[PDB]
Structures are given as C-alpha cells and as structure tokens.
Write an enzyme that holds these catalytic residues in place. Structure first.
Site, PDB file in Angstrom:
ATOM      1  CD  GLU A 324      -2.927  -1.271   2.274  1.00 48.37           C
ATOM      2  OE1 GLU A 324      -2.586  -0.831   3.399  1.00 48.37           O
ATOM      3  OE2 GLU A 324      -4.023  -1.846   2.089  1.00 48.37           O
ATOM      4  CB  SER A 325       4.063   2.162  -1.468  1.00 44.49           C
ATOM      5  OG  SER A 325       4.677   1.337  -0.502  1.00 44.49           O
TER       6      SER A 325
END
Ligand SMILES: CC1=N[C@@H]2[C@@H](O)[C@@H](O)[C@@H](CO)O[C@@H]2S1
Length: 504
Positions: A324-325
C-alpha cells in the site's frame, strides 16, 4: 453420488478420546493403554551428547506442561534405557523421509516413544503427545479425578509446508511481551513454526532503535484510538526471540517501508520534504504515507534501523513490508525497494515483502514474496525470479469478521468464518510458484485486548494451521468440524477466549 456444503448448525454452535490438530499423516489405535502416573520420568537420547542436551531441554518443557495439570513432578533423565511408565524422546534412528519436523509417536502399555530426525521434530511431536492425553492435561492448574491415559496408538507425521506462520500487528494496538509470548505459546501447540511481528506502521513504532531514539520517545506514544501505545526495548525483543526459539519458532521482524511509515515521519521531521514532523495518527486509514524515495537521509535511516534490528534478530529474514505505498510512484517504489534490499543483504539478511515488492528490479531469488492479494497476476515477478512465496489469501486474514454481525474485525476481504479459514489450498492463491507456505495475518485495527485476539484467532487459526500442515488430500471440512467440536474443551482448558462459531 450426492454432495453438499455446510450451513449453520441447528440450535447453535456445538462449541480414550485424543484430539489431534492438525490431522497427522497417519494415526491408528490398538488394544490397551498407557497410564501416566506420578512416578513417570521423561527419558531423552540423541545421537551425541550435544543433541541429547537439546532433547533434555525439550523434555523439561514437556515435563513443565505435564506437571502443571497432573500436579506431578515428572523429571527428565539422559538415558536410552527408559523404564516402564516412561515417556521416551529420541532422535536415534529417525525415519529420514519425515524430514526435520516429522516424527513417529508410538504408545504402548508400558511406554510412550517419540522418534524423530531432529530435536525440532521431537518438539512438534510433543504437541501431538499433549493432544493424546485426556482433555484436562492442558489446564494450567492441577486437575483431579481424571486418569491420565493414552490409548495404544501409532502415529507418523510430517508437514506439507515448511512455512506455517502467524503475524501479529503490534503497531495498530500494542500488546505486552507477556501477551505476545502467550500467543506464540498457544500457536506453537498447533505446530505453527513462524511468527511475523509487524513492529511499525502509521499509528505506532514498536522497536527501540538506539541511533534514532525519538522513534520510541515520540513514535511509540500512541496507537489506533488514542490509547497510550508502548514498545519493546531491544532486550525485550531478544526475550521474545528466545521464547520463540524454545518452541522452534522463527521470528521475522517487519519494518514496513516505504509506505505505512507515519510513525517514523511523526518522530523525525528530517524524514519529511518540509523538514517538519507529521502529526501522529490514531485513525485507521491506510496508503497515504511515504518515505522520501530520492533523499539519502531515507537510506541512512533505513540502514541504521536494519543494522540494529539485524544485530538482535537471528532469523536470516527481515520483512521490509512494501504494501500500500499509494503515495509512492511506481518508479520510486521500484528504486526504493531495490535499495533497501541491497542494505538488508549487506547486513546478512534476506528480504521478505508484501506484493507488489517482488516486482522491484532490485529483488533477488533469495527475496521472498508474501502474496496477500492472490490475484491472477500477483507474483508473476516472484515466479520468474525463482523467489519463494508465502500465501496470505482472504482465508488467512484472521482479522476479518466471522459474520456480518461480529462485534470486532474488518470486512474488506469479506467475512472469514472457521469453515472459510479451512476450505482452501495454497495452490488456489498462486499457480506455478515455489510455495514456501502459509501465513495467517492478525491485523489489529479493531483489536484492543487479549480477549479480542483470542476470539479472532480461535478457532480460525486452527483451520489455517491444518491447511499448512495436513496434505490437501487428507483435508475435509466435515472431518475437521467434528474434530474441532471434540477439541473444544481443550480450548476452554487453555483459557482461550475463543468464538463459539455457529458453523461448528
Ligand atoms: C498487506 C496489508 N496492508 C494493510 C494492513 O496494514 C491492514 O490495514 C490490513 C487489515 O486487514 O489491510 C491491509 S493488508
């Protein structure tokens, strides 16, 4: 022929009689029984004095468990001449086909004999031994009025997958060293052999880093919902590692990067483009935070963290996250994850990362993908690169509500009851991969107390543990469900505040 799927049990959850879970490769029962009496000793014998010494420690751990419920004082003897009424633990003449974690366990009228290839297999086999004794044996206080018998029986056993893990998120809500040790202990009884600690996220940083002391002084001081937070000193972390090692459990620490980094960003302003500390976050949003991918300070920070963590974490693996960058560009993520992999490798550690971290051009075939997305294209890179894969599908996301009406849990992967947690196979999640194993993930957005952990892990983890251990051809929900009903008193006896799932 006629077939069906399971519905809920009419009238509510159902939640001489051994209760082995996970199901072993073979289990037969013969005539007669062994009786564990107050005069019993545990005899240990390895192939050399060093191995005998290790077995002796394992024997003492077993004696401790047995003594707590029987009220006996079973002691351990280094000898290959066990006496009638003894338990005998040996690695002499192990069946090599059973591998490092496998064992034979044969109970006769006069003797319990556990024969393994390695001390590790004696430990796993001891978990089965505890399940052959009557319910009551797993009590932490003395049980009276129960004859401590074991049926004459023959078990052979070994795991299907090498990696069978549990992840605990201690970032979203903090749990004490005792609470963590307890979860490790409970999991170990079901042959879980890996413990992944998610030590940092947006709402908290949980590991002392001496070179960056504000990670604790500022970054540990909260959690989801504004509780006080907490952290592990390096000495406390070493203590957790040591406790897990006694159970032949590898501890894999995770420092999540470049995303899920708000706690670090709230501790040191120099980690942010404007040089100012972020405000601490106590909400449950994800995806918004990022390290600066093109600043050298970022890589100095990562190196200091990795250097200190490697020094205190004997596992050959460090988990660097990578999930989830959403505030990091694809190009920057590729570059960042490659750089931090090079740093970890320089400190003698192989990198584990969530998908899509395998896509980094800096990954090596020694890197490991933790495949949580489990979509058709996930781990295409890992497969091409010859990277081992740990699977964590929806079925292993134990933080999901059992049902729509669960009082705790999330639901972005749907609901996960005990049946869903059982009815899957690692090969479902990814095809054409070197599947290293399974990891059950207990994220803690909505779990505050030990009771919450117990409720969500039990009985869900039991399902996942069997998926990791028992071969697919020997797994069957109708079988497991009935075995689980049988096992219920043992959960009670262990003080586990499990959910009485109406599908069981
Ligand atoms: C790879 C992980 N990234 C996120 C975690 O930090 C938790 O919020 C989890 C809750 O289920 O959801 C996703 S799965």
């Amino acid at each position: 022929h006629h077939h069906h799927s399971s519905g809920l049990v009419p009238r509510g959850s159902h939640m001489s009689q051994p209760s082995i879970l996970p199901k072993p490769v073979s289990y037969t029962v013969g005539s007669g029984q062994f009786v564990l009496t107050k005069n019993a000793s545990i005899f240990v014998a390895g192939n050399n004095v060093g191995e005998t010494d290790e077995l002796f420690n394992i024997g003492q751990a077993l004696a401790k468990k047995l003594n707590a419920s029987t009220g006996y004082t079973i002691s351990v003897v280094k000898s290959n001449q066990p006496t009638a009424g003894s338990i005998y633990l040996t690695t002499v003449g192990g069946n090599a086909a059973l591998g490092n974690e496998g064992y034979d366990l044969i109970t006769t009228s006069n003797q319990v004999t556990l024969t393994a290839n390695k001390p590790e297999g004696v430990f796993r086999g001891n978990q089965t031994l505890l399940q052959l004794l009557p319910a009551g044996i797993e009590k932490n206080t003395v049980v009276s009025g129960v004859q401590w018998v074991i049926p004459h029986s023959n078990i052979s056993d070994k795991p299907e997958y090498e990696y069978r893990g549990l992840m605990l998120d201690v970032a979203r809500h903090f749990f004490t060293v005792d609470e963590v040790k307890r979860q490790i202990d409970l999991a170990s009884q079901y042959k879980i052999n890996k413990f992944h600690m998610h030590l940092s996220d947006d709402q908290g940083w949980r590991i002392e880093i001496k070179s960056w002391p504000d990670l604790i002084e500022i970054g540990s001081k909260g959690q989801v919902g504004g509780g006080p937070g907490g952290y592990y000193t390096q000495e406390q972390f070493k203590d957790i590692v040591s406790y897990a090692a006694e159970r032949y459990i590898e501890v894999i620490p995770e420092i999540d990067m470049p995303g899920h980094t708000n706690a670090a960003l709230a501790s040191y302003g120099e980690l942010n483009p404007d040089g100012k500390r972020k405000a601490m976050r106590t909400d449950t949003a994800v995806g918004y935070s990022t390290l600066m991918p093109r600043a050298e300070i970022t890589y100095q920070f990562v190196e200091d963290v990795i250097s200190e963590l490697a020094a205190i974490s004997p596992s050959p693996y460090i988990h660097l996250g990578g999930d989830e960058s959403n505030a990091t560009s694809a190009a920057d993520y590729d570059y960042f994850f490659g750089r931090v992999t090079a740093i970890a490798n320089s400190y003698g550690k192989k990198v584990v990362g969530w998908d899509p971290s395998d896509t980094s051009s800096g990954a090596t075939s020694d890197s490991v993908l933790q495949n949580w997305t489990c979509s058709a294209s996930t781990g295409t890179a890992a497969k091409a690169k010859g990277m081992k894969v740990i699977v964590s599908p929806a079925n292993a996301y134990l933080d999901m509500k059992y049902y729509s009406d669960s009082p705790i849990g999330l639901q972005w992967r749907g609901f996960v009851n005990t049946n869903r947690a059982y009815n899957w196979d690692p090969t479902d999640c990814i095809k054409g991969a070197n599947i290293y194993g399974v990891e059950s993930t207990l994220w803690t957005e909505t779990f505050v107390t030990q009771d919450h952990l117990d409720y969500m892990l039990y009985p869900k983890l039991l399902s996942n543990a069997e998926v990791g251990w028992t071969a697919r051809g020997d797994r069957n929900w109708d079988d497991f469900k009935e075995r689980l009903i049988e096992h219920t008193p043992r959960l009670q006896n262990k003080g586990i505040k499990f959910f009485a799932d109406p599908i069981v």
